[PDB]
Every structure is written in structure tokens, then in C-alpha cells.
Amino acid sequence: GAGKFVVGGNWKCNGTLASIETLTKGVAASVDAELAKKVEVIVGVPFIYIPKVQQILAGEANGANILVSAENAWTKSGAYTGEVHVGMLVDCQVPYVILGHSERRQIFHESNEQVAEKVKVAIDAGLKVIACIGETEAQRIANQTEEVVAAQLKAINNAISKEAWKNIILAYEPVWAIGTGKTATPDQAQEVHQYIRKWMTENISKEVAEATRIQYGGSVNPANCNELAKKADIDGFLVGGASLDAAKFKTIINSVSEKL
Amino acid sequence: GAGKFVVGGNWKCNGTLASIETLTKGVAASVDAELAKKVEVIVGVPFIYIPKVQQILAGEANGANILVSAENAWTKSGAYTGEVHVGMLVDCQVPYVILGHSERRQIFHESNEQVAEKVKVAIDAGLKVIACIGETEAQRIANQTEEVVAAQLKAINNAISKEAWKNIILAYEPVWAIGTGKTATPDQAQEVHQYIRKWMTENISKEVAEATRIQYGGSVNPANCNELAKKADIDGFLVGGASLDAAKFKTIINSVSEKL
């Protein structure tokens, strides 16, 4: 893609005030002004720790180079005990939100349409979004990779305007490579990213397709980030476990070099 | 109940930094030392606003009289994007957590067993819990109130030790009468509260049954709180909409005048 390389660190349900202070300081320290010009860096933080991370970044020399993202959001205010609304994120000056992550689609049964509604409400409120898509092991075995991803994308596109895509980062999760014993190769990852690019080109426009960053959201570590970054349609990463270690995350952020 | 009157204000999915600052200050202002001796006051806050509420309370004269509770919590750390686990609440010094609220049991399909699991890990971590139970309209007309409530309670008891019950406050939600058009009378509420007490007495012990506070968690407001507070087994309230108004909330807190 033609978009600026973007690396997000999804901390998932991990962290303590102490570990997060060390991590946040390490992440900010790794992205100075010069590097920030070539890579957008985002950290996905558990709701309760967002204020702490914001506080830490405020005191860091490179704090402005690290953007805070929530890991989910709800779209209805009122009688929904336990949920954090999109509006609360905006109220708290959180610029990003990760939506439709495979863990929420599977464990919390978020459907294509429910994810699309979240994306729609989030963007309408001004949030930028990392929208997660991807097929399961069963779906890939059934050779439904393209059909499944297309359906996920269509649900999202049907809900928003062409202009709304300007805030969207897509993250491809090869769910079929998650605890299955099957690892996605750069070639396999690129094959799906290429088709996502094609889907956007066919249904929206070539311009939107090329402008939209498609992050690879499979297993990313310091040992495979460069090989993956070499792929034409991988415009960044949504890192899992490795994002909890500032040193590992640093190596991944720097793999943007493969694009220069 | 022989337990201390306890009033929880479940803010659910509502609030902004501005509205919460005004509300928190109003709630704290409404509970001085003398009233605090009669009523334990808890506020259920959206995850992202917990730090703010904590900060506000620390700066108010009566701040120590108001306890902060989360509105939900996940079982543990790990690959659960969007979730906040019990350990994070303890790490942030949050003393309470509301679990099994009807909105989560119905909307997010939390089963009796799943809720029980959460209660168990919450208490293991050191949290105090407001565990919600209650039957639907379909279950009530089918005359299954006792069996349904018994099953919800059994799931919880099966997962924890006798001593773990010290940390538990039960909240009965007459789901069949919350915004349905049906009004739960004080007599109807007392009847279910009595049976909850009876269930604990036969399934655990009379000591635990009497020590465990049973809050009424149906629709509570300034107009109906006193008649409910007069009931022998209504040891407090878990207030919904009315908790977003300091004046209405303190009116409800003061219904403890029916106890003394």
C-alpha cells in the first residue's frame, strides 16, 4: 500500500500499573521524532489503564509519537452494565479503537454486522479504527478465505460512507494460524492482503484501497517482522505478545526499513 | 438482614468526565461521617473513569465514605482483547466489582457458571463482590422463581468456600419487573429476598445467611425506596438510573431511616 507504515501493539488483557509504566516509557523512548516521520505507532490499552498511559506519555519526550487505542468499544448508552461507550473514549481524548478482534468475535460472539455497527458509530464519533478481519481454520479448510473476508468487509462497508474509510486501518488476523498448528507464511499472508486490497478496489475505489493500511495481525515477533514487512501489501502490524516487551516491539517498529 | 445497610449506585454505561465530576462530588457531599456509620455507599463506575473518580474522591472531605466498584471483570489475564480482569482492579485499588448483572447475563450471555467463575476469581484476588441474581418474566409466570434463583446461587456456592461468602453482597434483580410494565411490590420483593435467605440457610449455614446482605436491585427511586427499605430482608439497594442523580441517590441512601 501507499499508506504510512503503522504498527499497533495490542496489549490485550495484560498489565499492571508498574509493568505498564515500564512498557510505556520503553515504547516512547523507542520512537523519536526522526523515526516517527516514517512509522505510526499505536498501543492498545486495557480501559482502566488508559488514563495511566496517557499520564506517562504526557511526561515523555517522545510521548506525542505514541497514540493510545482502546481495545474495544460499545455503541449504546444506558442500560449496559460493564460496557465502555465510544463517546467515553472520545471524551477521554483517546484517538483510536481496535474493533472486531478475533478474540471478541469468537469469545464474545461479535458478528460481522455487530462489528460493522461498532465501526460505524466509532468513526461517526471521530475515532480512528483498527478493524480486524480474518478467517478461521474451518473456513480456510473449506476454501472460504476470500468469501469470509469479503463478507466481513462488506458488512463494514455497507455501514459507512466512502469518506469514513479515511479513518480505518484494516488488520488481517489469520485465525486459522492461531493455536491450530498451522503457521501463516509471508506468501500466504501476502495472498490474503492482496485480496483485501482487491476487494476495496472493486467495491470502493483504487484510491481508497491504496490509501488504506492493511496491517498483518498474525503472529509477529522480532525474528519474522522483516520478512513480513517485505511483502507489498503488508502495511504494518498489529502485534500481540511481543508488544508487551518494549525491546521486541522496537525491533518490529523498525522493520519499516524494508519499505524504504 | 443483620448486615449493614448498603446502597450501590450502578452508573452502567453513562457519563462524561464533566458529568462524573459533578456527580462524584455530589455523592461524596451527601454522605458525612454520621450517615456513613449507617450506610455503606458504593458507586459502580465505567472502567475508563475509575481513575478519575478515585482522584475526585481523594480530594473531597467525605471521599473516604464512598467506595468504588467496577461494573464487571474478566476472569484472568491473557488473550482477551477488550477485557479488564480482576487482577487489574486490585492493582488499581478498586475494592468492589459488580458481577452477573442481568444486562450482562442477557446481552453478553454470561451463564450461571460463568458468573460463578468470575465471583470465585474476584474473591481469590481480594475483591468484594456484588453478585446479581434474578428471574425473567417467562420464568416467573412459569412459577420457577425459586428454582431459577436457587440455580444461580448454587453455581456461585459450588465455586467458592464458605469463608469466601464474607466478601459477597447479593443483589436481587426482578428482571420480570424492570422496565417491563410490571411493578414489583415491596411484598413481592421481600418474598424473594426471604427465599434467598432461606436458600443460604439450608445450603450454607444460618450464620452466613444472616451475615450476607441482600440488596434489592429492581427499579429503585425516591418514590418507592422507603416502602422497600421497610422490608426485613431488604438490606440495601443496587440503584440503576436514579444513581446518576446525586439528589435522588442520597434520597435513597437516607431511606435507611426505615432500619436504624
Architecture overview:
The first copy, chain A, has 260 residues and is an alpha/beta fold. Chain A has a single domain (1-260), classed as Aldolase class I (TIM Barrel, Alpha-Beta Barrel), CATH 3.20.20.70. Chain A is built from twelve helices and eight strands. The first copy, chain A, has helices at residues 17-29, 33-36, 50-58, 86-91, 102-107, 112-124, 137-141, 145-159, 186-203, 206-211, 225-229, 246-253, and strands spanning 6-10, 40-45, 66-70, 96-99, 128-133, 168-172, 214-216, 236-239. In chain A, strands 7-6-5-4-3-2-1-8 form an eight-stranded parallel β-sheet. In chain A, α3 (50-58) links the parallel β2 and β3 (66-70). In chain A, α1 (17-29) crosses α3 (50-58). The longest helix of chain A has 18 residues, at 186-203. The two termini of chain A are 13 Å apart. The interface between A and B is large, with 42 and 42 residues.
User: What is the CATH level 1 assignment of chain A?
Assistant: Alpha Beta
CATH homologous superfamily identity of chain A: Aldolase class I
What is the oligomeric state here?
A: homodimer
Give the largest interface pair and sizes. Answer: A-B, 42 and 42 residues
| Strands in their spatial order, largest beta sheet of chain A | 7-6-5-4-3-2-1-8
The DSSP helix count of chain A reads 12
**Could you state the order of secondary-structure elements of chain A as H and E?**
EHHEHEHEHHEHHEHHEHEH
How far is it from the N-terminal to the C-terminal residue of chain A, by CA? 13 Å
Tell me about the biggest sheet of chain A? 8 strands, parallel
The level of helicity of chain A is 40-55%
CATH architecture of chain A: Alpha-Beta Barrel
Q: Structural class per helix/strand content of chain A?
A: alpha/beta
Keywords (chains A, B): Gluconeogenesis, Glycolysis, Isomerase
GO biological process, one term (chains A, B): glycolytic process
Organism (chains A, B): Entamoeba histolytica (strain ATCC 30459 / HM-1:IMSS / ABRM)
EC number (chains A, B): 5.3.1.1
